[PDB]
């Protein structure tokens, strides 16, 4: 979406503002969507003051007295088109306007031209009419809106697509519709009418994830236009729904309050919901500025900027306990009529550029160059740093974040004033019965307790889903974590920890509305805090999670009674309910089992909610059954305010406090482990675990996580889910209450009536004889491998291992119900034809050895299929078909390879773009028949690439332009994709640089992917990849292998269906991958909707993976997943083998086609109706699963057109296209020429210069050009200005630019200069936006002005001088040189692992801001460092004329001192940080 305001202080309501808003909305177009029409908009809107002039002709024509300003008030109302319904409708507005003692003057029919609307909008269009109202008693301003508020709210009880109040106030009015932006003015005529005048305008342009517009949903709403995504919806909506009965405010009556009856409802959008919520705060006597602060608070903690402001730090300290953030990104813009303003989510996830004139004329908005002010008279050009607000007040004054936040610092204060004033070894079988397991303590608790980090591991979760498996499992194992993909971002929880927190308030929340004077550092509370708390504010009913045998018979009762016990205790004044399965001190054989703590914390949490009471107490879950990082998250997630994992905590104790261990600690394991460190380690490793899980969905605060329920349950039954975990999706739906009970009996069986010596081992993490199944195992793959080595019994073996398996995935419940007679293999399409649908699927040159990697690519190129360049670049030598192949099968070009033929090519068909952008280079981008945006991987959704240092050899270092020693933990998000629109920019950047190349976007299955996919389709992609939770990794956390992601049967299905219903299905080809290994897997994916098929792990196997499963270790015995030369030598493996393996898999498909009876996989895809539920299968745990989610897809028997895609989506006529047009193709093809060109840019001009880089690149690779094209520009640059810029390419920006300047930059120069006519101080004044220089690989960028957040995020080799910046300066930086001549946000070094950065920070405070975790703060001391800073502080002045630049130069001797230098230990010993 695009959002913005324009405000006018020192004029009176002109019509030009109104024109300006509309124009501006115009340049938001590329930020919004279109419906199936490609014509109707996902929405456009505008808030203004009542255009009291224009309405003057209404009263006039009717011969009526127009009421005062504050006493008119105007309902802008959408209404049914059918006349009789239109009247029914209108009689009601009036009924209820009447029913507050107000009076109707009548109604103005809103002049409109329906002819401009696209067909779908037009079919939808409500009939649109303004009701004009007044109050006889003499009500005005605040009381009248307050009353109207009550009225639009009552009218809101009957909300309909056909019946909806856009706005009803005496102060503000909304004109909106399902129109493309520049059409908004053509539809509504009022807006093009010079009697239309307003002191301001809030404008919004919508981008939806569907294709069926509903008019109410366009969006500047009643109070705000929101651009962003609440990523905690469900929680927030629950903690508001609970606030709802007990509202109290000043003379607000219990009858008026009750009238906003449900002010929040999960059926509406975060937006409607946010507006609503923020309304209730405003109409109840806070200004929208304050109400935003309560609801979308900055990250105050650690905030240098709050040194002089401790009042504000206390209002959050306060509000922090009361109201948890509405998280996710957000640029919020809102008006009261009294105030108009804007501010950001705590993270600054949306751009917000403002502009101010000598006459305090302001212009805020998503994009800089938008309303066009007369440059000469610009006073300030700024932006909102994270959490910053900026406003305007009718008393003619603008209002920057400081006053502002202080102004409600100041009042209702008690702030800080009141804040102040507020033995045997039964363990061995407790453990057993609670469900611990040999692998749980040995492979999980132990490592946390010993190293302080939950374990790393490798490969995919091979094993069946909790519900279909035959081995005991925890209830936790049914909940898969959800995570952010395109539609919002993850946050980096280690590099941006400073913004997170695990605080968790144990008091009861009161009135949000009534600020009266009248805490737990982490959720994990140790025995000490348990007592401490059990002293504390209130007394605290233990409620037996326990229950005796036979009498109270079943698990069902003890639930019924726990909740009743809970309900009852909370009424009786209990303000904390500690639910112990350890009540009064012990857990017997005949305490004959438990309530599972997840079940309990769910039940009491939803049943309290159901009781009006959830707000009264707050819950501690005191359980043995919690040890996992994921366990803790299930618990907080479904309600726990905190947790005391007493047995977990015990298991550290026994393990350390044991002879075996203490011994090895005397020599072997680390004896740096007094017990105080083992425990402080165990927890401290749980804390990093929670930070992680939240960051997977982009959530900063356990506080927010704590309502929400950021999970999808696979295999829980409908009743089970409502009773305990309400409103969680569970589409396959298995277990019942008794069913869970039976499982808890399975491992209670085994600690008690029997014996106890060591907890059982089922091979969950790793293949065992005794234990859980695994789609891949070392003996299984040894033989598959020997099969492909030849050209046989090994399939009898390999195929057999594949028969032996239980139920593992959802496809296993299905089977074929052919609708046509069996057919003949010779009619089926050839093996060569299928093979072209196969994809090796991208595993990183880091992670695999180049031997294994180049091999997949040569084999995949052979079959005429595709291979994928994981995430770690590609060696340029591969981009060349091979000449030199000799008799023996070898090539001097690739000596390490074997079995090569003369036409082979090791070049990846697909080039991956991932968060680190490691090899991401114009030629890279150009050697690629397709490009892949890696939103996420199966093994680890909300998380970045991971490559341990062990494995970062000089080769890799060189490839990634990063440092030899060092570990590569990529950023969770692309710093580049904070929203769907943002996605569309990267897709566009990439279609821009390689028009030829299809762009896929890779997403993991989870509920929500279908909506998201709809977005990716509208965002202009060519391919979407669904990856199951199944898939492999050469490294991930084990938690994530086993707990994040959902089956791809869910993914593919859901995307296929949504795509079809939204009529976007032709737009895109779908890849499915994750755990495919067999033709029947291909046929299952195909029926389910997939057109290509991806193979990682197996492809590896077929080259000679055993399943050592030591991938993240750099030990592959077998030469595949290592960088060790020794091991690499032992790589057996030739292209022929994988080539053959996919000939098998294809053959095997051809014959399924035969039993089924079609010629061509083209005939089966999404013929979901060919599937039926299997007759044999019975599982251990429930009677059955509901498979509606997989069987019920769009009939595809005749509608198969969607299966025809355009060869590649285009970016459109684009300015580069012309650039590339003039005498210009002579400066390229004549390898050396100067050319100059000059152009106006407007901010629709995006990625400019980029196509021409690709142009040169495609012919001279990155460094072969000696020409000198100088393109000079003027205006406001759109997104990605000067991306992927090459050598011999100079770009002048006369003006300003937006976000992503220099993205990808490889080579050459980008100079950006304010327009000369500015009377402002360049250095004090912003000129470039967020994430500039992202993954820069060469180049130098010179810019006269503050830049955005993330400056030079993943900068690998680019250089730059800018004059100031926001937060995260130099984020994951890794080489090159960055020079900043002005202030800079906090976190000023996060994970910057290589390269030099020089600041100049005169407030002296910089050291407080800097991220101290790896970078070190020096004073320039090396005289070769000065020689570095002066060259660039000079070069800047040469290219610009810089006013802070020139200053520093002829006062060189002075400024040089107090002014720091950033060194990574990595550069400690270079001729520029030493001597
Ligand atoms: C060794 C290894 C490295 C991988 N590297 C990447 C990576 O660089 N980027 C990515 O998106 N997926 C990566 N993956 C996942 C694959 O792209 C693919 O999604 C997955 O391996 C398919 O699941 P499967 O192993 O069950 O076939 C990797 C997987 C493994 C086995
Ligand atoms: O090679 C990398 O940069 C990381 C790839 C990854 O996370 C994986 O191997 O699963
Ligand atoms: S599991 Fe991995 S460590 Fe080796 S044998 Fe396979 S590549």
From Swiss-Prot:
Cofactor binding notes:
Binds 1 [3Fe-4S] cluster.
Annotated [3Fe-4S] cluster binding lies at 1105, 1111, 1116
Kindly tell me the pathway this chain contributes to. Answer: Amino-acid biosynthesis; L-glutamate biosynthesis via GLT pathway; L-glutamate from 2-oxoglutarate and L-glutamine (ferredoxin route): step 1/1; Energy metabolism; nitrogen metabolism
The residues covered by the Glutamine amidotransferase type-2 domain are: 1-395
PANTHER family referenced in this protein's UniProt entry, alphabetically: FAD NADPH DEHYDROGENASE/OXIDOREDUCTASE, GLUTAMATE SYNTHASE (NADH)
Q: Which family does it belong to?
A: Belongs to the glutamate synthase family.
The protein depicted here goes by the name: Ferredoxin-dependent glutamate synthase 2
Name the source organism: Synechocystis sp. (strain ATCC 27184 / PCC 6803 / Kazusa)
């Amino acid at each position: 979406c695009g959002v913005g305001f324009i405000a006018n202080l020192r004029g009176k309501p002109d019509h030009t503002l109104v024109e300006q808003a509309l124009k501006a909305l115009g340049c938001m177009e590329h930020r919004g969507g279109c419906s199936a029409d490609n014509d109707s908009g996902d929405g456009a809107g505008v808030m203004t003051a009542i255009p009291r002039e224009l309405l003057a002709q209404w009263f006039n024509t009717r011969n009526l007295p127009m009421p005062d300003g504050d006493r008119l008030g105007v309902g802008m109302v959408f209404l049914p088109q059918e006349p009789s319904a239109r009247e029914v409708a209108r009689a009601y507005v009036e009924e209820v306007v009447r029913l507050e003692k107000l009076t109707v003057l009548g109604w103005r029919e809103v002049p409109v031209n329906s002819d401009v609307l696209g067909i779908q909008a037009k079919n939808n269009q409500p009939h649109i009419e303004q009701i004009l109202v007044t109050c006889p008693e003499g009500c005005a301003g605040d009381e009248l809106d307050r009353r109207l508020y009550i009225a639009r709210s009552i009218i809101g009880k009957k909300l309909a697509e056909d019946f909806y109040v856009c706005s009803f106030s005496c102060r503000t009015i909304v004109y909106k519709g399902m129109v493309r932006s520049i059409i908004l003015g053509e539809f509504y005529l009022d807006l093009k009418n010079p009697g239309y005048t307003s002191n301001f305008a809030v404008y919004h342009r919508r981008f939806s994830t569907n294709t069926m517009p509903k008019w109410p949903l366009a969006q500047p709403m009643r109070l705000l236009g929101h651009n962003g995504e609440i990523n905690t919806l469900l929680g927030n909506i629950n903690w508001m729904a609970a606030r709802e009965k007990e509202l109290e405010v000043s003379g607000w009556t219990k009858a008026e309050l009750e009238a906003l009856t449900p002010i929040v409802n999960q059926a509406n959008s975060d937006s409607y919901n946010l507006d609503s919520a923020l309304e209730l705060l405003v109409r109840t006597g806070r200004s929208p500025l304050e109400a935003a602060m309560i609801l979308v608070p900055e990250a105050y903690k650690n905030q240098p900027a709050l040194k002089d402001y401790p009042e504000i730090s206390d209002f959050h300290d306060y509000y922090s306990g009361l109201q948890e953030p509405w998280d996710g990104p957000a640029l919020l813009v809102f008006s009261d009529g009294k105030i108009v303003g804007a501010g950001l989510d705590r993270n600054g996830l949306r751009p917000a550029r403002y502009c101010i004139t000598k006459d305090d004329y302001i212009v805020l908005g998503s994009e800089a160059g938008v309303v066009d002010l007369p440059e000469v008279d610009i006073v300030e050009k700024g932006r909102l740093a994270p959490g910053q607000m900026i406003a305007v007040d009718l008393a003619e004054q603008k209002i920057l974040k400081n006053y502002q936040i202080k102004q409600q610092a100041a009042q209702k204060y008690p702030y800080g004033e009141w804040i102040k004033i507020q033995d045997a070894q039964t363990v061995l079988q407790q453990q057993a019965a609670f469900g611990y397991t040999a692998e749980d303590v040995e492979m999980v608790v132990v490592p946390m307790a010993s190293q302080g980090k939950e374990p790393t591991f490798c490969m995919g979760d091979d094993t069946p889903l909790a519900v279909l498996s035959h081995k005991p499992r925890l209830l936790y194992d049914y909940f898969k974590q959800r995570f952010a993909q395109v539609t919002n971002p993850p946050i980096d929880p280690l590099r941006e920890n400073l913004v997170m927190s695990l605080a968790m308030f144990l008091g009861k929340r009161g009135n949000l509305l009534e600020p009266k004077a009248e805490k737990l550092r982490s959720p994990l509370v140790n025995e000490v805090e348990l007592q401490a708390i059990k002293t504390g504010q209130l007394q605290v009913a233990e409620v037996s999670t326990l229950y005796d045998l036979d009498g109270v018979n079943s698990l069902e009762d003890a639930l019924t009674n726990l909740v009743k016990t809970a309900i009852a205790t909370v009424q009786a004044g209990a303000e904390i309910l500690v639910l112990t399965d350890r009540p009064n001190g012990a857990i017997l054989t005949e305490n004959q089992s438990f309530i599972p703590p997840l079940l309990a914390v769910g039940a009491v949490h939803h049943h309290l909610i159901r009781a009006g009471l959830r707000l009264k107490a707050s819950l501690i879950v005191d359980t043995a059954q919690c040890w996992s990082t994921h366990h803790f998250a299930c618990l907080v997630g479904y309600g726990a305010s905190a947790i005391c994992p007493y047995l977990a905590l015990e298991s550290v104790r026994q393990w350390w406090l044991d002879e075996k261990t203490q011994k090895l600690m005397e020599n072997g394991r680390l004896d740096r482990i007094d017990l105080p460190t083992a425990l402080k380690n165990y927890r401290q490793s749980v804390e990093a675990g929670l930070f992680k899980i939240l960051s997977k969905m982009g959530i900063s605060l356990l506080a927010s996580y704590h309502g929400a329920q950021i999970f999808e349950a696979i295999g829980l039954g409908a009743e089970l889910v409502e009773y305990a975990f309400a409103g969680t999706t569970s589409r396959v739906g298995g277990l019942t209450i008794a069913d869970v009970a039976g499982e808890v009996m399975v491992f209670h069986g085994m600690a008690f009536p029997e014996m106890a010596k060591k907890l059982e081992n089922f091979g969950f993490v790793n293949y065992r004889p005794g234990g859980e199944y695994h789609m891949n195992s070392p003996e299984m793959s040894k033989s598959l491998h020997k099969a492909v080595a030849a050209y046989y019994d090994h399939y009898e073996l390999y195929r057999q291992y594949l028969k032996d398996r239980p139920v593992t995935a959802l496809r296993d419940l299905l089977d074929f119900n052919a609708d046509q007679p069996a057919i003949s293999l010779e009619e089926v399409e050839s093996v060569e034809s299928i093979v072209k649908r196969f994809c090796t699927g991208g595993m990183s040159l880091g992670a695999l050895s180049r031997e294994a990697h180049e091999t997949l690519a040569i084999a995949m190129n052979r079959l005429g299929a595709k291979s994928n360049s994981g995430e770690g670049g590609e060696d340029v030598v591969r981009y060349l078909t091979l000449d030199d192949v000799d008799s023996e099968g070898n090539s001097p070009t690739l000596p390490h390879l074997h079995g090569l033929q003369n036409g082979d090519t090791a070049n990846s068909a697909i080039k991956q773009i991932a968060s680190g952008r490691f090899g991401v280079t114009p030629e890279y981008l150009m050697s690629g028949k397709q490009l892949e945006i890696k939103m996420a991987q199966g093994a680890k959704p909300g998380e970045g690439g991971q490559l341990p240092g062990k494995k970062v050899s000089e080769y890799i270092a060189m490839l990634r332009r990063s440092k030899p020693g060092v570990t590569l933990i990529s950023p969770p998000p692309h710093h580049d994709i904070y929203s769907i629109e943002d996605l569309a920019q990267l897709i566009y950047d990439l279609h821009q640089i390689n028009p030829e190349a299809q762009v896929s976007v890779k997403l993991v299955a989870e509920i929500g992917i279908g909506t998201i996919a709809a977005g990716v389709a509208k965002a202009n992609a060519d391919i979407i990849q669904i990856s199951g939770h199944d898939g492999g990794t050469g490294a991930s956390p084990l938690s994530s292998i086993k707990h994040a992601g959902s089956p791809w049967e869910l993914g593919v299905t859901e995307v296929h269906r949504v795509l079809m219903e939204n009529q976007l299905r032709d737009r895109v080809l779908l890849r499915a991958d994750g755990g495919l290994k067999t033709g029947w897997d291909v046929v299952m994916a195909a029926l389910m909707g997939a057109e290509e098929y991806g193979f990682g792990s197996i492809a590896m196997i077929a080259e000679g993976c055993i399943m050592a499963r030591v991938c993240h270790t750099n030990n592959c015995p077998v030469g595949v997943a290592t960088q060790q030369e020794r091991l690499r030598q032992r790589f057996k493996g030739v292209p022929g083998q994988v080539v053959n393996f996919f000939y098998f898999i294809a053959e095997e498909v051809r014959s399924l086609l035969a039993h089924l009876g079609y010629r061509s996989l083209d005939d089966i895809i999404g013929r979901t109706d060919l599937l039926k539920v299997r007759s044999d299968v019975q599982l251990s745990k429930t009677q059955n699963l509901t498979l509606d989610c997989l069987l019920n897809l769009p009939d595809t028997k005749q509608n198969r057109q969607w299966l025809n895609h355009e060869p590649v989506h285009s970016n459109g006529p684009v300015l580069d296209d012309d650039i590339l047009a003039d005498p210009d193709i002579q400066e390229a093809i004549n390898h050396q020429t100067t050319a100059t060109k000059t152009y106006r840019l407007v901010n629709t001009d995006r990625t400019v210069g980029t196509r021409l880089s690709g142009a040169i690149a495609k012919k001279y690779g990155n460094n072969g050009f000696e020409g000198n094209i100088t393109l000079n520009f003027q205006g406001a640059a759109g997104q990605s200005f000067g991306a992927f810029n090459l050598d011999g390419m100079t770009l002048h920006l006369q003006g300003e630019a937006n976000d992503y300047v220099g993205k990808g930059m490889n080579g050459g120069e980008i100079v950006i200069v304010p327009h000369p006519q500015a009377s402002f101080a360049p250095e004090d004044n912003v000129i470039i936006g967020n994430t500039c220089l992202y993954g820069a690989t060469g180049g130098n960028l010179y810019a006269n002005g503050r830049a955005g957040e993330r400056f030079a995020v993943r900068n690998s080799v680019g250089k730059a001088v800018i004059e100031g910046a926001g937060d995260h300066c130099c984020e994951y930086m890794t080489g090159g040189v960055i020079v900043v001549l002005g202030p800079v946000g906090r976190n000023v070094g996060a994970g910057m692992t290589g390269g030099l950065a020089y600041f100049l920070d005169e407030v002296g405070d910089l050291p407080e801001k800097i991220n101290p975790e790896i970078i070190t703060l020096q004073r320039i001391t090396a005289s070769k460092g000065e020689e570095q800073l002066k060259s660039l502080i000079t070069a800047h002045v040469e290219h610009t004329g810089s006013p802070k630049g020139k200053a520093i130069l002829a006062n060189w001797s002075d400024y040089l001192g107090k002014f720091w230098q950033a060194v990574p230990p990595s550069e400690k010993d270079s001729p520029e940080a030493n001597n």
